[model samples]
Target chain A: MKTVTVKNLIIGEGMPKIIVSLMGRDINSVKAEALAYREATFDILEWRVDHFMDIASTQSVLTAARVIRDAMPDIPLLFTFRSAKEGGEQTITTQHYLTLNRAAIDSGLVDMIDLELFTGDADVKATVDYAHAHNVYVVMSNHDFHQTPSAEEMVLRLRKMQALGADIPKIAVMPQSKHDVLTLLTATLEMQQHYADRPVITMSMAKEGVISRLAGEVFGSAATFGAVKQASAPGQIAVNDLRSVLMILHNA
Target chain B: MKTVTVKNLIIGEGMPKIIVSLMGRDINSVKAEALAYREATFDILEWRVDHFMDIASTQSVLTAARVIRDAMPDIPLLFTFRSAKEGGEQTITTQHYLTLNRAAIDSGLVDMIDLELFTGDADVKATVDYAHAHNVYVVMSNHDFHQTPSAEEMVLRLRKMQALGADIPKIAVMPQSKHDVLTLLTATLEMQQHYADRPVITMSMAKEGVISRLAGEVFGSAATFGAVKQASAPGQIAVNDLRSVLMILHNA
Candidate 1:
């Protein structure tokens, strides 16, 4: 499998990389959260742009990202704007989503950017091109917060995402039953074994999906999310607690 | 999906039941750890007798069991003496094993007993018969701390266990890779779907197997281990942390 190295961190096989999401409404709040992780030793910092109150303003978004980026200069930061359709807070149009992602990548603050694959193929491909052109990794993602599809369907979605020139293909699905989690995991293992040319990030969401976050290394997920104080998604374990458990699981 | 009620708690197709192992050198240490779960909820208490310092004395073993059974009269107590070859502390002849197990069941102190199926089939059937005749549930158990077997072998093991009249069939294995965990889960889910007539308990041991403990319901394992203050096996999480996470998974 192809390994993606961001700065000093190498994410592929072996011990799964830990990504802590920085979610706050303003510069101070965001900075405070980022500062809390100075000693956390998380692999990457994700800036959830949709959570910022002034995200609509280009200057405000760039300023907040820069402030967070400067706070943890050594840590890689992933820029993402989740749309409401995909269980994200933002109710954004395709053009608005593209504009926001382009600005974040073009500003040269984020190490990687997540673009929703459900957007028109043209827009998604264009965004992936732009992000890659700026030397930023593009993670193409598909999120279904209500129900999970079959393993074949999830793999298809991931394959399509990969085909659109994404550096990493990501999928997050909400499980209505315990079996749904297994379906997601089956797809993840399958991709990691045969389909994926590079590392793939997939999650079975909610508390039922907690194991998926921690099971990344075993199932071939390149990264798993942890929280400093605020979580960018449901079922995110506290960063310290998550790190402690991961260390135990990995060390064992 | 069938539900097996031990005391007032149920284990079945939904949220997998949590069974905490109680292990200490003597009565006080054991009682202290077992009593610590007064506020924390666990579906069953498993007394791993091999950890008892005075286990050689029949009197001491029964006395400890009596004290523990008295302390948590409401919770179901599962008496187990895991043999040394099976990753336990004890090594004894078949006669000694049968004698200790028979004494425990006849004393009316435990609600359940786990006997190894690898013990001669006749001895296993005899023990199962005696335990059930005395109103004690039999949990036929198999453990391999070294490595996981093929799914077919696992299924065959559980089938043989069920055929021996165990109320629940349990198997724990150590996974060498991420795929090994999948093989275990696939075997578990397959058993839950087609083979078993009762609740089945299965685990893939250590770090790679952490997901099996957390993925119980998804993979069709009926019960998982959580630690109070002591752990009987690898990859066991603390009771509170396990409960908090299980609740989140079930609630979601």
Candidate 2:
């Protein structure tokens, strides 16, 4: 597989990368938030564009993207408009979602775009093709907010995502039990050892499964998300805390 | 090898037992805290007596023990006076510490006592022997706050604690990295698979290593400590969280 850019890091093989998600809920604050993560030494920034205002207008979206690119000019950005059904805070029509993603792809402000795997006949192939045409990598993601699936079922899910022409396949689940966490970790290890087409990111959310976030790196996840202050997701450790623990583990 | 009475439960082979720790900074609060844990469905109540009031009077110690025992006649009570240097909240002299523990055992209120592995050699052996003479099971414990040791080092450490005549060998460490967490889990698995003749309670603390709290059961750890309102240690999940997660994992 070819290398994919996330901030200044190139993720494909070898060293794992870290992606810090920035969510400020307003365009005026979005650039500052992205820069804050960059100052924290994060390698990649995920701009949750859906949280910004005026997201419905293509010009507004382009201007917001430009502000982010200007503040962290050299850093790679992954643009995402996560739908409400997939743990996102925004509610946008399917048509509008695709249009916004297409606009971002053509704007040349983002290095990659995140497409929900369960978006349902949303022309995922065309989306991937469009992003690739403009050198924008596509991360196909699946999220289960309830119980975690069996190891076999998890593997099948990853396989399905891989088959969908994703530059990277990502799966996140809420673990209700320790075994559920183990199931996620075991599946990640299986994919790491056996599947090598593109890098995969797997994690379990909630306080019960925080271990998955740190352990993801060991099981071959390309990147794990950390937050600056408030968590972008349910179980993220602070960026400073994550880096400190990783350093200790690296030395060990 | 033999059952140790804790309130109403006998902790040994063929017994269903759970360990609950009560933490408070005052004597009255210490006694009340134990009652709260018992009310919350704990079978065994552990008084982190090291955090109690500085009165050091036999009357106060016995009064507190009697209050807890009277409140929950069926539950067994364990007493521990951990030193400040060993992750405990107390700073008493070694002589006073052992004397306090000895007084608790002599009062016939505590069914067991904990002896730190690093306690002055003569003090640890003396306390273990005294506790055994008084029919109190001695839990010999070692704590590593920084990072988990290698499997070989863990095994050696557990062996040394066992050799010190600990009825149960308990080891807790902070996992600095994912591999460090793995080392602790694998070490627990190895001990359960091999050298563990008595019950072993091995755990890793901190957010990144909290999975060991529940997963320890699968690795053959006999009992885990949970708090009612606050964590007694760094990585403790609440009692309610632990119970629900354990049920889910067991059923799954």
Candidate 3:
């Protein structure tokens, strides 16, 4: 296990880091959403660039990033252009995704960037390297909205992502039953006890799988996503509700 | 510690049970919410009576409970009317709360009911006795929305809840920092190691304290709350997210 400092907080030490996702469809909404998360005292504000309408254009992506940076100057932001194949609601070509991410990272608008492991290619690798040169952390993520995988398979996937020079490796999967949930939790605990480097964010998506989200902290997750007004993800807790629950857990 | 059984699930066995909260403004929505949670494969469905309109009337509470029971015939349903003082969205007199709860239990629509410790002498003993007579579990709960308490204090509170004939003793508090979260976890672990007799559900609310929700499982919490569409309590992950994270932890 290794530790990484995001802002002033040390992740991968004893518990998982809390990450809040912020989604807004437009530039003005993006700024407002960033500010709102800042006011909510979120540790990390993830800018979901894929949600934007004009995100196909590099200029629009740049503008959105700049607006978010200005609104939340102190808060660490993680920029991501989620693809439809990766459980995101939007669709974007791999070329456009890499191009937009490159511009956002180069403009110094974000502290970290999320690059889906499944989308990795030479171009994306170049973008990740460029972001790293600019002191931006690269988080490699994989989302399986369908089913949980075997422990061995999960570990292998995480290892592959780590080998790709990812600052952090993240994986989310969906569970079909209680037994499936057990499989996911076992994998997370194993990662925390064994292969975790930087920090790994692991969660089970869908209704039967939510316990994994809270359990991630104990098993060694770097972050968990909370919804703003509308949850960008399928099984996200609202910010206010998440804050309160976290507070209760802290004192329990 | 008293033990209560929800069908085949025995709740008090060195583990805190996860209780998912469902809030619907109307009976139809309540039924739908409970069914959704069932589909999400939640172990328990908690219905917040106070969130409903005209819930002061016993008939309304009974109707809501019946709807939930019909939707998930085998799943346990926990009924509660959260007071405004404990970060609840609704406020109602203690007398009304007890009356409505009694009616729900009498109607055989619920398998368990939650009674807050701060409700004063509002027939708590009688309600617990009545619920027991009907083979219904009674959860004695305390909530501190302001700040986390010392481990000794929390343990004492849980002891009191247990002494009062509660089938499961629960407590929720707010944490100001990571240290506060550590305190809560330590207390829960200590209680589980020492005096915890019945199933205990303890959590720390707020963003800074999110770890408490997950760590509770490792510390012997039998259950954790999972959000449906929106969470009834703060910091709840959707059932699906919770299951996946738990799977990761289990595997890890």
Candidate 4:
């Protein structure tokens, strides 16, 4: 029921906010994407650090985040390093993951950062604590690329994320059947109605589960991911169309 | 899937066609709706005759149909008389229902007619045969306002409609839970993939099942229902919103 404010945009009120991922490999590519996104329709711009070619260099990562923040100064910026373990492009060690997230939080360039829920409890809590201390909101997330879990399990994971001091708890699951999408939606409805004290984000991945992304406002997801030319995840529709449909649903 | 052409609108291809219900009680009300719908975006205009107060007079019904057909001459017009047993306002005997449908078909003012599936096999078949002979498409339908049947049962009903010579088979079920909506969608996928020889329309009613209406193309439905100003069903959204979302999903 509580809303999370990032810049001028307020999540968990009215329609679900749209988030577009910027997946660029190098400084030039990142700058190009960030500059081009000025014309895009989205509430937040997410920089997928795992896709950057210079993942080992903290300076390079900071430079990329700075470029994105500078190019789109008015919108909220989210820093995320999706490890290969959770369907991201690159593999990362637990220590490196924590280091990257801490750097983004410490740099003060990102308005929010994503931390995987499966990260060790102590590490996740520490990172979340650091993020809050630095005035950076945490969006704790988990992704299942192969199949959807039971509603009870998803609810538990979201609750755990919320308990870890996350500003927003998020989960994405892949649906193999129509029933699986329902399960994800049921989990979202249950979490928002019964458990969540703050806004939560949930989606079922791929074409079969695209409804979960679009119907977030009705089913209790606070934000949805979209694409602008290139997509960081599967089944993300164009941001223009996504925004138009979101507005329509909101007004309807 | 085989396509059904009504006027310039083609069903069973590309995005699911949009159908807006026109519920009017008298000739003046029906005329007002038809004229107002000229500015709306829709593929089919379905006149829900059961809502008409002049249902006792076949001539008055025919006059209303003519006014609608004349006003929106380009788009397809479907005649539907839902009995009280299946969530309609008026209750009619089986003999009177058949007589009304046959009159609509014979009048040549409607492009299509809806015949309920449980109207007895013999009468349904004879009426379908008569409609085909008169070059009118029969959209055989079944409505479950109370609860959704199992996937197998829904498939069986759809298959039965197909066997009875329906040009387009349709089913609408009310969902008691999110899982019920999934059951409706599963039945649609199964019917389209394995058994259907013609286009079929399926939906789960109310807010929880609105996704089933918007997600027709992905999950194998041929058409969806929307509302102009007043909704005939529980979860029918505005036609403009419905069309926008459908196009977004189609192009995604």
The i-RMS of every model, in angstroms, reads: 3.8, 9.6, 10.5, 2.8
Best by lDDT: 4
For model 2, what is the error of residue B55's alpha carbon versus the real structure, in angstroms, after optimal superposition?
A: 42
Better structure of 2 and 3 per TM-score: 2
Instruction: Report the C-alpha displacement of residue A19, candidate 4, in angstroms.
Output: 0.9
Q: Give the residue spans of candidate 3 off by over 4 A.
A: A247-252, B1-252
> For candidate 1, lDDT tens digit of each residue in B94-119?
89889989999999999999999898
What CAPRI class is candidate 2? incorrect
Which runs of model 1 end up more than 4 angstroms from their true locations? A26-41, A53-55, B1-100, B107-112, B118-125, B133-137, B143-165, B173-177, B186-200, B214-252
Model 1 scores a TM of: 0.74
Q: Write the per-residue lDDT of candidate 1 for residues A1-252, one digit (tens) a residue.
A: 667889978878667888887788888888887777787768888888888888678888888889998888888889988888888776867777788889998998889998889888988878888888889998889999889999999999999987888888999999887668788998999998788788899898887678788777777788888777767787787776666566555654
C-alpha displacement of A76 in model 3, angstroms? 0.6
What ordering of candidates by DockQ runs from best to worst?
4, 1, 3, 2
Candidate DockQ values, in order, are 0.30, 0.05, 0.07, 0.39
lDDT, residue B135, model 2: 83
lDDT of 2 by residue, A91-165 (tens): 999889999999999989988899988886448888888988998989888888888988788888787878878
lDDT of 4 by residue, A163-206 (tens): 88889999999999876877888899889988999999999998
TM-scores, all models, native as reference = 0.74, 0.57, 0.54, 0.88
Which of candidates 1 and 2 is the stronger one according to TM-score?
1
lDDT of each: 0.84, 0.74, 0.74, 0.90
